[PDB]
Design a protein around this ligand. Structure first.
Ligand SMILES: NC(=O)C1=CN([C@@H]2O[C@H](COP(=O)(O)OP(=O)(O)OC[C@H]3O[C@@H](n4cnc5c(N)ncnc54)[C@H](OP(=O)(O)O)[C@@H]3O)[C@@H](O)[C@H]2O)C=CC1
Ligand SMILES: COc1cc(C(C)(C)C#Cc2c(C)nc(N)nc2N)cc(OC)c1OC
Length: 225
């Protein structure tokens, strides 16, 4: 029953996330939000998991990986098993889906995990739409005079709004209590769409911390023996 949460920073309106193997931007305060969210837990005896594709792993400076105080899991089609420790703080997996089922096992995890964060990869995010319970999406907008950066990787916005709804009214409650943010819940229009969340401003960008939650589901079938 461990919540699976996608976390990503995306530039509106197309929701671009990467370019040529790196981020299209460099925002310290967005990085800090990511570090604190994925690291902090409400229960001190637990840690969070961070799962990521191989290319995303290789984009992290060798000095900052693996991400400290979080269980790191790198997935690659050419890895040996569904989940194996290869280094202190580093697990390898050849399957995102199996990797998750493995993590959920309370025998294996001893209920010592609080949340599972899918920290990205365009290819990974694309496969996480049916897997994630929530999405922590930082919606980014270039200020009036800011140049829109070039991007080559994007989040599935259609799939997102098809399965999830903007639950940003519940962002603060959803985050680990230790975290404190500067802004307050704001709701504004940008390029036609409604943008709601906790507003921040750094460099030439304005961004919003938002939360997306699974849309209510009809009861069609429940398995019986
Ligand atoms: N803005 C944001 O919040 C974030 C942005 N990014 C950006 O995304 C870009 C990287 O994304 P992308 O290029 O799509 O690469 P990914 O990070 O998504 O990794 C893709 C690789 O992951 C492995 N893989 C994919 N699916 C599976 C699976 N189902 N099971 C096991 N392994 C799998 C494969 O590795 P292999 O080839 O070894 O088999 C594949 O080549 C970068 O530009 C980065 O900056 C990344 C994270 C966050
Ligand atoms: C490119 O360097 C880094 C990339 C990343 C990745 C690419 C894994 C990321 C991310 C990410 C950010 C920055 N924001 C949000 N909202 N979600 C993310 N997955 C993490 C890092 O440590 C925090 C990095 O070093 C500081």
């Amino acid at each position: 029953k461990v919540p699976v949460v996608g976390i990503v920073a995306a530039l509106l309106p197309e929701m671009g996330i990467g370019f040529q193997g790196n981020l299209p931007w460099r925002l310290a305060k967005e990085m800090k939000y990511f570090r604190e969210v994925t690291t902090l837990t409400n229960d001190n005896s637990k840690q969070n998991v961070v799962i990521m594709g191989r290319k995303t792993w290789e984009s992290i400076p060798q000095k900052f990986r693996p991400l400290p105080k979080r269980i790191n899991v790198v997935v690659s089609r050419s890895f040996d098993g569904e989940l194996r420790k290869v280094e202190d703080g580093i697990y390898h997996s050849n399957s995102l889906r199996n990797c998750l089922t493995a993590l959920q096992s309370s025998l294996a995890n001893e209920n010592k995990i609080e949340r599972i964060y899918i920290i990205g990869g365009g290819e990974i995010y694309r496969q996480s739409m049916d897997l994630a319970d929530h999405w922590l999406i930082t919606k980014i907008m270039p200020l009036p005079e800011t140049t829109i950066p070039q991007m080559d990787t994007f989040l599935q916005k259609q799939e997102l709004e098809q399965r999830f709804y903007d639950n940003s009214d519940k962002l603060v409650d959803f985050l680990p209590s230790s975290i404190q943010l500067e802004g307050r819940l704001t709701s504004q229009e940008w390029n036609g769409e409604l943008v709601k969340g906790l507003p921040v401003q750094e460099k030439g960008y304005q961004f919003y911390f938002t939360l997306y939650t699974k849309k209510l589901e009809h009861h069609h079938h429940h398995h019986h023996h």
